[PDB]
Write a protein that binds this ligand. Structure first.
Ligand SMILES: [Co+2]
Length: 181
């Protein structure tokens, strides 16, 4: 079994924390942001689990993505975020994909998940000697900012939204795993 606790994370940046108006830094901030989304996330947990299983990705990582992208729906306007570029719980960029499903649907969660997997694949080809946990983290960074932006493992969030995208996602994911995802 893949153990996401083994993925390294320094959690959220100062910029990100300015979101729920937090004095907390890093992993503490990611954990608080995640906690704030737990009730909304539970509405989708059955779908999140099933999609994760079908695609072979930890459901807790899907939850981390959904928390970061949409605050489990709270940050969207009728399904839309990112000035309209992003659709759904996982904020699939409509400009680059034909959107499928309702904004809170299994089909949507499956689409976002498939896109993430494809990024993880690209990072695996790019850095074939990185451990699997690192290629996972790198694929998550690429989900925000593209695989070209992912170079040094230690700097993969430089140039992502908040300067912390995969670190924040991973830390939130780890929190959701502790809450049974
Ligand atoms: Co196993």
């Amino acid at each position: 079994h893949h153990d996401i606790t083994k993925v390294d994370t320094s959690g959220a940046s100062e910029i990100t924390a300015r979101q729920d108006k937090l004095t907390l830094q890093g992993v503490d901030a990611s954990h608080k942001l995640a906690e704030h989304d737990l009730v909304r996330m539970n509405k989708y947990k059955e779908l999140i689990t099933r999609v994760g299983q079908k695609h072979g990705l930890d459901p807790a990582i899907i939850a981390g993505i959904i928390s970061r992208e949409s605050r489990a729906g709270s940050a969207l306007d009728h399904g839309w975020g990112d000035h309209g570029k992003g659709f759904g719980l996982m904020q699939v960029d409509k400009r680059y994909h034909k959107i499928v499903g309702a904004w809170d649907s299994e089909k949507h969660i499956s689409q976002g998940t498939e896109i993430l997997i494809e990024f993880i694949r690209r990072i695996q080809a790019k850095f074939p000697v990185w451990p699997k946990e690192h290629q996972l983290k790198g694929g998550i960074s690429a989900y925000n900012a593209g695989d070209k932006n992912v170079r040094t493992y230690e700097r993969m969030d430089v140039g992502t939204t908040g300067g912390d995208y995969s670190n924040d996602v991973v830390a939130r994911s780890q929190w959701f795993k502790s809450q049974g995802y």
